[PDB]
Ligand SMILES: Nc1noc2ccccc12
Ligand SMILES: Nc1noc2ccccc12
Ligand SMILES: Nc1noc2ccccc12
């Protein structure tokens with residue numbers, strides 16, 4: 001992979017692996033989400049982030065945390081295909097930052113997918129959110145394009161729509177989901193992609209067999225600890241559309257809410 | 266990746282990814298096992314296997330299934346490091362075939378790991394095992410070296426040791442493990458690497474925090490179906506710690522796997 005000529009975005013090519021594909025022999029949405037996080041990490045490393053916190057963030061024990069992930073796939077790359085992904089960051093004032101991605105077929109150059117994410121600053125010890133200071137902002141502004149560059153430019157598009165809370169009883173559910181060591185990242189926290197997999201666990205297999213996932217929007221509210229147990233709830237709201245909720249199996253504390261849009265194969 | 270000059274083995278280089286590493290910022294044994302299966306698939310594709318069954322196997326509805334996996338790691342590659350893996354197959358008569366792997370640091374060229382696996386032929390529909398026929402053997406012999414080439418050449422080496430059955434009560438356990446869609450392969454069967462992860466779930470976190478996994482041997486006896494629930498059992502059998510492992514169905518206690526692990530103090 002490499003930073004582009006202007007040093008304001010990063011591109012990397014990936015060959016889809018045998019274990020990364022589903023029954024259609026194309027990459028799963030979890031493989032795509034893993035590749036988006038990989039190209040994001042390689043981008044941070046390439047612009048100087050130590051092995052993505054700035055000097056002032058490390059001093060104040062502050063970290064970036066995902067608030068929302070939104071992915072739209074037009075065509076999933078097949079096993080053996082090369083997919084090229086370009087990513088960049090942009091500040092959205094004191095609220096936080098946005099990381100965007102564009103996925104392309106390396107052979108044709110056509111856009112096969114796009115993604116966007118909202119990141120907020122959190123104190124790693126107290127878990128208190130807080131806005132972005134001018135000192136922190138000034139440290140990372142030099143790595144972002146200044147004119148707006150949006151993967152989702154359309155005025156008030158799917159990536160920015162408010163998501164309601166699923167009301168009991170859910171139409172479908174998958175209960176007692178627990179993370180194993182492979183679900184954790186290098187910091188022993190549950191990987192963000194695991195939550196996407198858990199959301200998808202409550203979609204009936206008949207939908208997965210006759211449809212392709214087109215759009216997924218996920219809000220992150222609270223993290224699942226290594227010893228927590230999760231229930232995944234889904235209700236049809238309609239192409240098929242679903243409303244999703246992940247909550248702790250015991251007291252019902254919300255961890256995530258989301259929506260999915262599926263296209264008939 | 267590419268077949269070597271003689272066309273009897275295959276090599277591929279991998280850059281270790283950020284999500285593929287554990288708390289030590291080096292690749293997990295499950296990432297290594299996934300890379301071994303990836304280089305194995307690329308080897309089958311390179312020698313002509315359709316997207317690894319031969320013409321006669323497809324006609325008879327026969328497939329290769331793993332009976333045993335054995336992995337020994339000297340050094341786990343760090344995040345961003347390039348690891349080179351070489352793999353080859355050898356027939357072991359009518360019993361089945363063996364696939365071996367060698368892992369190397371691409372920068373130094375030193376051997377950082379090795380692995381070996383035993384594969385048996387099974388009818389896809391009835392699940393009945395069988396010896397390999399001469400017709401099937403003749404179709405894949407041309408892709409294997411004829412002189413023995415062993416990743417584990419040693420005399421009474423660990424890769425061929427018989428594994429006993431763990432007796433209740435287990436010292437440690439992790440109950441109610443279920444596969445999710447990411448645990449399935451392109452044929453909707455549980456991926457072999459998932460079973461390694463489930464075995465490791467019952468190792469106490471204190472061992473994982475103070476030791477590095479050196480050797481893992483796993484026998485495969487029965488597959489976990491998409492709607493089955495598994496219990497992972499572990500008992501210490503021992504600077505080094507050794508454990509005996511058992512995976513069984515949560516309900517009736519039907520064995521799916523048995524294994525052993527060897528851990529060295531960090
Ligand atoms: N999950 C991630 N997407 O982009 C990133 C950039 C730096 C670190 C983590 C990520
Ligand atoms: N990892 C990063 N690359 O560019 C950035 C700009 C702002 C915040 C983080 C990053
Ligand atoms: N899991 C595997 N290791 O090697 C292989 C070769 C062909 C197909 C599957 C595998």
Ligand SMILES: Nc1noc2ccccc12
Pocket residue numbers: 305308309310312314317354355362405406408409
């Ligand atoms: N996938 C394969 N590459 O070489 C082989 C030799 C024997 C059996 C299978 C394979």
